[PDB]
Amino acid sequence: SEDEFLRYLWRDYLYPKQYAWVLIAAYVAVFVVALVGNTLVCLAVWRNHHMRTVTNYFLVNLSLADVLATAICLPASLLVDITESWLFGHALCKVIPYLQAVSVSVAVLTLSFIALDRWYAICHPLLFKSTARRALGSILGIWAVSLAIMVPQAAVMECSSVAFSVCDERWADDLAPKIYHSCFFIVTYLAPLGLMAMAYFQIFRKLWGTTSAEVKQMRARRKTAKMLMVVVLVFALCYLPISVLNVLKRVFGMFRQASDREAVYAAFTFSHWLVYANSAANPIIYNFLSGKFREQFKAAFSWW
Ligand SMILES: CCCCCCCC/C=C\CCCCCCCC(=O)O[C@H](COC(=O)CCCCCCCCCCCCCCC)COP(=O)(O)OC[C@@H](O)CO
Ligand SMILES: CCCCCCCC/C=C\CCCCCCCC(=O)O[C@H](COC(=O)CCCCCCCCCCCCCCC)COP(=O)(O)OC[C@@H](O)CO
Ligand SMILES: Cc1cc(NC(=O)Nc2ccc(N(C)C)cc2)c2cc(F)cc(F)c2n1
Ligand SMILES: Cc1cc(NC(=O)Nc2ccc(N(C)C)cc2)c2cc(F)cc(F)c2n1
Ligand SMILES: CCCCCCCCS[C@@H]1O[C@H](CO)[C@@H](O)[C@H](O)[C@H]1O
Ligand SMILES: CCCCCCCCS[C@@H]1O[C@H](CO)[C@@H](O)[C@H](O)[C@H]1O
Ligand SMILES: CCCCCCCCS[C@@H]1O[C@H](CO)[C@@H](O)[C@H](O)[C@H]1O
Ligand SMILES: CCCCCCCCS[C@@H]1O[C@H](CO)[C@@H](O)[C@H](O)[C@H]1O
Ligand SMILES: CCCCCCCCS[C@@H]1O[C@H](CO)[C@@H](O)[C@H](O)[C@H]1O
């Protein structure tokens, strides 16, 4: 009676309201910070002439994928998690996921090149000379590949006619989605991250009668090595949920029992927010583990 009302008030109104608020709150925070974050990350590079290494041009490219995700995809990501209907029509059903898929590729690819350029620069020197000119050439290819291989993704997207629309992959047969999503979890999460991890372990064992300038070089390479591993670990953790969730859905046909549909909606919703949290996370990573970015942020915060 008197206390059963108080409980029944909670799940039909109090919980649904407190849940929806937290959803829009975390999304607006990530949207703003990730937007303000990566924007300042570019100005620290366009302004501070000393901070233009091969790694920073790649990290600037990492912001470019994050913004495409945040500005275009992220607003679309919020409305679907709230209503779970597609409201941007047949065509944005293909564009938004494609940009989002392309931004993942450009991201995970850029991180591998920063690992690869550093693995040669620190572990196998003057094998390849990596100048900013070759660093920028690499950055253009990432988009050429990301824009291509996410194309088959765009083809599978179809907006479902069945009084509200839904956007989802249209697979002609059971086996293709298993192979497609098995291949791309390997290609764009596990294979890059596992390789990049083995790369950075080789760097840690190295860095952790040489000239005073050389140890000055080691002191800078550790501050960058320390910072970059944080960026990769943050990336794997952020993308671990949605990446595993997608394989369970598409390869193992999981999340098809309707009993805890809220728990499944909830599960995926946090997984989607974690992706954009990585975009807002990275600029914060630079401010703490990079003393030159940190001064660029304080200098930018005072003028604006
Ligand atoms: C070291 C890292 C490794 C990678 C390194 C980079 C390698 C880069 C390679 C190539 C770049 C070019 C790729 C571009 C391929 C684009 C292919 C594509 O869009 O396929 C569509 C159909 O796909 C579809 O529905 C089907 C798409 C899904 C796949 C179907 C089969 C399942 C298995 C698939 C195989 C496993 C793939 C996994 C990759 C990770 C085409 O039809 P569409 O709509 O135009 O209508 C017909 C009409 O328009 C044709 O004129
Ligand atoms: C995908 C592969 C699978 C990933 C997931 C892996 C899952 C697990 C399976 C096997 C891994 C273990 C095998 C090795 C076991 C032996 C120990 C180990 O960790 O391997 C290190 C070597 O590899 C290493 O540094 C690794 C080399 C790092 C290379 C970094 C590449 C940059 C990343 C960009 C890639 C883009 C690709 C595109 C994909 C779309 C050893 O060093 P260490 O000093 O003891 O001896 C140096 C000595 O070899 C000198 O003669
Ligand atoms: C409906 C739907 C789906 C998504 N799928 C994903 O992100 N898949 C995804 C991401 C990475 C990988 N790897 C293999 C690394 C595989 C699959 C969404 C992602 C978002 F960020 C936001 C949304 F609103 C989403 N909505
Ligand atoms: C339906 C759908 C999908 C999305 N994304 C994705 O499928 N990504 C994605 C998918 C596959 C891969 N592989 C590497 C295989 C990578 C990324 C969406 C993203 C959004 F931001 C908003 C939406 F409404 C979305 N809807
Ligand atoms: C953005 C927020 C979106 C909605 C999230 C709802 C999560 C579960 S609360 C929901 O409240 C309803 C009120 O009637 C009840 O019928 C259901 O049994 C109960 O599960
Ligand atoms: C026509 C199809 C699109 C191709 C455009 C990009 C061509 C490659 S530039 C090349 O990229 C490498 C990536 O590893 C770097 O290592 C090099 O320094 C850089 O010179
Ligand atoms: C005139 C020819 C027009 C062809 C239009 C193709 C549109 C996408 S076909 C694509 O084919 C895959 C088979 O590989 C299936 O798995 C996918 O579900 C399906 O979307
Ligand atoms: C006939 C369909 C229903 C039975 C179960 C099929 C399971 C397919 S798993 C799929 O097998 C491919 C084989 O090549 C690999 O390429 C992929 O990596 C892997 O994920
Ligand atoms: C504790 C178990 C939780 C669920 C995991 C089993 C999913 C059964 S479907 C089946 O699963 C195979 C692997 O088991 C895949 O190889 C096939 O492609 C897929 O069709």
Q: Whose CA is nearest to atom 12 of ligand 4?
A: 101
156 CA to centre of ligand 1 in angstroms: 10
Q: What is the CATH number of domain 1-303?
A: 1.20.1070.10
Distance of CA 197 to the CA centre of its chain: 17
**CA–CA gap between residue 167 and residue 84 (Å, rounded):** 9
216 CA to centre of ligand 3 in angstroms: 42
Q: Whose CA is nearest to atom 18 of ligand 6?
A: 134
Experimental method: X-ray
Q: What are phi and psi of 150, to 5 degrees?
A: -80, -10
Sign of the dihedral defined by the CA atoms of residues 164, 241, 180, 151, in that order: positive
Distance of CA 271 to the CA centre of its chain: 11
302 CA to centre of ligand 7 in angstroms: 54
Any atom of ligand 8 within 6 Å of the Cβ of 182: yes
Residues in binding site: 246
Strand partners for 168: 158
Tell me which residue has tokens 């094998």. Answer: 127
Any atom of ligand 5 within 6 Å of the Cβ of 194: no
Closest residue by Cα to residue 268 from 21, 102, 81:
81
* CA distances for 29 relative to 18, 25, 231, 256, angstroms: 16, 6, 20, 31
Nearest-ligand number for the alpha carbon of 192: 2
